[PDB]
């Protein structure tokens, strides 16, 4: 056996975090083997005790890895043997590395996804809570990154909560396809000892059992799916990071992040670098890379098991750790950032109310195209007098369209600007309250 | 220096014309809501609708006519409306914007495309499951590392693909539910400014729910990414199935032959068939994956809310939808019409693949896994040294390796008995494959619904 | 009996018509070689060449007429020729195959196409370079983490993009060279069986050399992947520049404005332009990357030699060729016609950005950086205390911090002198910029 | 200072590989600081002495890192003080982490590219040499994975070597741009102390120096290009692996991998699983994944430096180690695999010569169309007569075309088949010989790195 190739087959270098699930998997199997008559009652006790002690060695961090261990499965098998003797060997009866590895990665993923879920909900929750509290703050809404119209700071925050909520929904969909036991699939044709797979499932807490052994052994859908979910999640987070990074520019002045999530220099204590957000944005590429790699690893592979499939572990681990860290960093950034109502408020400009001005007419029967030209004509005027549109006199307005009354003054108020969007999903106060209620409901659904 | 070339990039009319009917539908739904909102008088309405319907027909009969001024499908339809009805149709744009219209049209279009793709997907699944039911007695080699591992039923192989496809169908449904949400009424960014009744819009357009936030509804393209993720994984599945059949159809394996319609030949080598169909299907995985990749890269780093960049979704969605619709039917064809060679499949099974069963023989007699496995190795080695296959070792020779080998060991050297060992749920044993067929059928019912 | 969908799925006519010309030229070259090989007589060659030149025209004047039987452009032409000069046309295919004829057309098309792209890429670089010389005096903020870091010449900025784009040009050349290798004469996969004169084919089609291995030349698509990698990196550069320009054109930054030609707007908000151009360019980065990912996966895992999978190459090549041609030109237009605001740019220059140079003042005076930094720190510190900008601190005050401060420390508080510190090669000092402009001019001459 | 954050910026666990390059970057800068008049000659010798001592520590591998260390950089600085004192602090003078980090990576990549180049050339040499030795072996050439026509085993081996040769040419082109000095660009606007960048260049063995400070700090083209070269190379390797995997199947039986690059069961000692090839093939996805990530990280970023660029190290390290391991595994596989000349021979069939039969007529003046027709008629005749085309008698052939003469007997010989392809790059022996020598020349030009 070649030196370099052996080092490539060697997963022991990173697959150690699968120690516990590999042990849990073995315990269930040993139980099913005793029920099948492959093990005696006493043997089972010996095995379980052995497996339990091994579990402790890892949790305590005292487990010793022999250079002869190519993977975590070999390590535990070797240990279990030097712990209870020959009897240890009977444990691998009819089992295969092929269905052991998938059972292991799936258990690990079910647990990790459970952890990713809490952080994700915590982020969404954090976003929603500030949307509640800062519901009066208004700032410009952008399109093409050019000030378009006023919107509530909360409508902006909520848009990110809503996207994340979808991420959460997908996470759940992926979580249930992962919650299917693949153990007892053997090398590819199934388990040859009529092993009780139902006992296996309930013992390991899966929701159901894999339908086809060839599929169960060679499919990495659960890996691709998780990656697809993780990548779109990062897209959302990269979009939010981009918004904030920009808003935190001295130019915009909208906000600045706490010191914990930014860096700085004693030469310019008035500027803060949003490292936190830059890191989050960059992880999108990192996670996408993993998605792209596994997809290509799978394209073209014939049935059933192929060594190519070992690339899955490192991709999942890296993604699980990336999301776990980035999600929390995002929650903190959101809860501890400081907006500037002042600058955010001074950002609002009269010119932005021009569209609302055209709406004022539409509400008085004046047709669409006709109102537009009227509103556009009104700007041209104030424009030629060196004054904003909210300033031009009532008489000036009259000359362009008799439709303009004295109430037209109401149009030049930002609170009024946003209150226009009462229709479901709008930036109006009422709509924002509705949304806040809906997200909290959806979060309850995705749990109880 | 290219203002004209700039305009060309914004041009979409060359490919978005398949959106004509969804655009018209969205406009009729909005006009109505515009009347309830009083923006339009009842009469103003009836004339608008009648105008949108004349346009509906113009496309539904290829009689429409685009001018060298129609930037896109929208402009092309509103221009014809200003031409049919007149200066009145202008009151329709009141309230909503292109940012609002765009996603509404794409979601309506995708919803229909998905349902169609689902039918084709389900047909493929039914074809595999059906063929698995009929050829349940066929046995061939099960492979790992493209090497003969152990005997398996040909049906187990077919069902492994059907099972994977079933997950594809489940994802398709999840992606469709998120697409069946009304985005119309979000306006250009902050929502509709006329308190338009969105429920009515939902009802008219037949969406299942209404979008929650106007900013999200206008800037998000999750439904596009998700669709592409579903498509790419589905393609991965199909690429694998194509690869398997390509290999099995080689003269070397000789397990099966594609029908004339899904393959090509040559006058000089009539008995030779190239698996054109399978190669096309396999090559589409990359094509679909690329679309996934492009959209993902297009979305990454974009700030709120709407940005021109999002205009790249249409072309990727159209390509993948057509690709999927064609690929799926071709695969159904291929599986439905290919010819298998029972003789060659069975002939490929060898005694050497039964060494594992030999070891299991001892395990069932109580011998420890290790001892048994070691004994089978010795038997394999002995036969090898005598230059004979293990199914020919005499009983004496076997007992010289372990007395546990009784005269009944002969039963081990039977390929049917080999696959019949796998009765545990999901195995290749006949009872197990039968069970799989019932489970899938019952799944095709939840997916059909 | 072929399946109708299989049929349609195999039709490239819809898009491969643009290969009409190069297909004929390949056929012309091959015919001439068939005459020399004794497969055709001069009389037959003349009749064939004449029938081909006729088809050429039919495409030129857009007169050519395609029929539903035309699966691909190769069939459209071969059929047309048969109609024109009778079944003598059949001989033209002697020893030739779709396999080597299809990759011959693709390289020829790409060679021509790349030639046009080179021109446009060079015109963009030039536009950037010439602008850098003209506005070399302009000074504005330099960003790190999208936060003001220190004064930089505006030209230093334009040039960083020209420099990146020149690397793109260098790659474009390296790719062109490998594309400029004749594949015709490779036959179906084992080579040409008629001892055809490939050197003659090369000379006629004008390639620089001939392919080394028939199998490789028919199965590899390195030339496509490589072109796509070059295009993708180019788009990245362009996407970054786009990002910079979109942000600079924000009301908030106000550093510049785009002409109406490459922008979009509203009659309700005259004082506002949306950078549609720059946004298109950025979006195309993904689009082109998509093609790259596409072909890489199509090729991955494919066996030797020819496979129908390779048919996906054309659509990917055409898309990117057209995308780059359109985008590169638009970029040029955007870069040449945009108007900067020297006022807002210098305005952005604040004394807080000279805190760094204050320390450098001490290091030149001999003060160890560790100490000169903490020194400048006390300065900004005491500066805030007195509620004044560091440029207002008195010599007396500066001395209380470090005796090394003299009357000249006053110069450190000048933007021109701030920038003029970077005279080291590639720095932002005017002399460094001019050296750059000159250097870029030299590179542009050689790559021609 | 957040704990998760701090852990995200850490890189000491993986960037230690950059120890020696970092120190070399310090010695260089230190000397440049002495010329700028910041470090007295006495201080220069003081530092250079320490820096060497620390570098000397890593060398013997006795260096020690503390938990306080985050960057391989700070790990070296911290240790500089522990040996030299406060004077160490002057090394930072006018030097940013921005040009210091891009300098370490290029210096590292340049050295990695050299190692990688060597292995690549070793792989090419192994293929070309084996081809020269087994130049007489003939086997089926495949198209759509179906026997298409006789070819020389060496023609097959050479097609891969040729592709691999272009990879080696891409390596050189990439190394060229990597071999440029970025140091002295500072944090963004360049070096502020008029540092002598020509001295740094000479000292760091770079070929030239960066043209623009902003570009040199923010660009990661060099990372992209390298990844692009690696991915194209891995594609090539995945194609070769697919081939060998297929050729090593029992069904094909064309060759067997040595025990060193394959897995096997004691129960089936004949079964040979091509682990080595599968590993190589799977790394293609792993590498492309890296390319994909960095590309998405760079997309849409604004000038100049952004913390995003930090994701480059791990991508480069992964692919550098992967390419190094994979290339050597490839080399091993190709030189230690045993071919079955006999099975490659028995795979050549008479049916694969109908094409040659038509060509026989073409050389005697018969037009392509008619030639192809006579041959096919000969195929039908042998079919109806129950024999193979080579068994048809002269009379059988004459009755199809008078142009057939007793000399047609030579058409039914596989050596003569491949010998028809004498045209440049064809599979005729003389052509294969010409390739071997063209490739040796090419390996020479490149070897002269």
From Swiss-Prot, chain A:
<feature type="binding site" description="in chain A">
    <location>
        <position position="98"/>
    </location>
    <ligand>
        <name>2-(N(omega)-L-arginino)succinate</name>
    </ligand>
</feature>
<dbReference type="InterPro" id="IPR024083">
    <property type="entry name" value="Fumarase/histidase_N"/>
</dbReference>
<feature type="active site" description="Proton acceptor">
    <location>
        <position position="144"/>
    </location>
</feature>
<feature type="binding site" description="in chain B">
    <location>
        <position position="273"/>
    </location>
    <ligand>
        <name>2-(N(omega)-L-arginino)succinate</name>
    </ligand>
</feature>
<keyword id="KW-0273">Eye lens protein</keyword>
<keyword id="KW-0055">Arginine biosynthesis</keyword>
<keyword id="KW-0028">Amino-acid biosynthesis</keyword>
<comment type="pathway">
    <text>Amino-acid biosynthesis; L-arginine biosynthesis; L-arginine from L-ornithine and carbamoyl phosphate: step 3/3.</text>
</comment>
<dbReference type="Pfam" id="PF14698">
    <property type="entry name" value="ASL_C2"/>
</dbReference>
<comment type="function">
    <text>Delta crystallin, the principal crystallin in embryonic lens, is found only in birds and reptiles. This protein also functions as an enzymatically active argininosuccinate lyase.</text>
</comment>
<dbReference type="GO" id="GO:0005212">
    <property type="term" value="F:structural constituent of eye lens"/>
</dbReference>
<dbReference type="InterPro" id="IPR000362">
    <property type="entry name" value="Fumarate_lyase_fam"/>
</dbReference>
<feature type="binding site" description="in chain A">
    <location>
        <position position="11"/>
    </location>
    <ligand>
        <name>2-(N(omega)-L-arginino)succinate</name>
    </ligand>
</feature>
<dbReference type="GO" id="GO:0042450">
    <property type="term" value="P:arginine biosynthetic process via ornithine"/>
</dbReference>
<feature type="active site" description="Proton donor">
    <location>
        <position position="265"/>
    </location>
</feature>
<dbReference type="GO" id="GO:0006526">
    <property type="term" value="P:L-arginine biosynthetic process"/>
</dbReference>
<comment type="subunit">
    <text>Homotetramer.</text>
</comment>
<dbReference type="GO" id="GO:0005829">
    <property type="term" value="C:cytosol"/>
</dbReference>
<comment type="similarity">
    <text>Belongs to the lyase 1 family. Argininosuccinate lyase subfamily.</text>
</comment>
<keyword id="KW-0456">Lyase</keyword>
<feature type="binding site" description="in chain A">
    <location>
        <position position="310"/>
    </location>
    <ligand>
        <name>2-(N(omega)-L-arginino)succinate</name>
    </ligand>
</feature>
<dbReference type="GO" id="GO:0004056">
    <property type="term" value="F:argininosuccinate lyase activity"/>
</dbReference>
<dbReference type="InterPro" id="IPR009049">
    <property type="entry name" value="Argininosuccinate_lyase"/>
</dbReference>
<dbReference type="InterPro" id="IPR022761">
    <property type="entry name" value="Fumarate_lyase_N"/>
</dbReference>
<feature type="binding site" description="in chain C">
    <location>
        <position position="143"/>
    </location>
    <ligand>
        <name>2-(N(omega)-L-arginino)succinate</name>
    </ligand>
</feature>
<dbReference type="Pfam" id="PF00206">
    <property type="entry name" value="Lyase_1"/>
</dbReference>
<dbReference type="InterPro" id="IPR029419">
    <property type="entry name" value="Arg_succ_lyase_C"/>
</dbReference>
<dbReference type="InterPro" id="IPR020557">
    <property type="entry name" value="Fumarate_lyase_CS"/>
</dbReference>
<protein>
    <recommendedName>
        <fullName>Argininosuccinate lyase</fullName>
        <ecNumber>4.3.2.1</ecNumber>
    </recommendedName>
</protein>
<feature type="binding site" description="in chain A">
    <location>
        <position position="313"/>
    </location>
    <ligand>
        <name>2-(N(omega)-L-arginino)succinate</name>
    </ligand>
</feature>
<feature type="binding site" description="in chain A">
    <location>
        <position position="305"/>
    </location>
    <ligand>
        <name>2-(N(omega)-L-arginino)succinate</name>
    </ligand>
</feature>
<feature type="site" description="Increases basicity of active site His">
    <location>
        <position position="278"/>
    </location>
</feature>
<dbReference type="InterPro" id="IPR008948">
    <property type="entry name" value="L-Aspartase-like"/>
</dbReference>
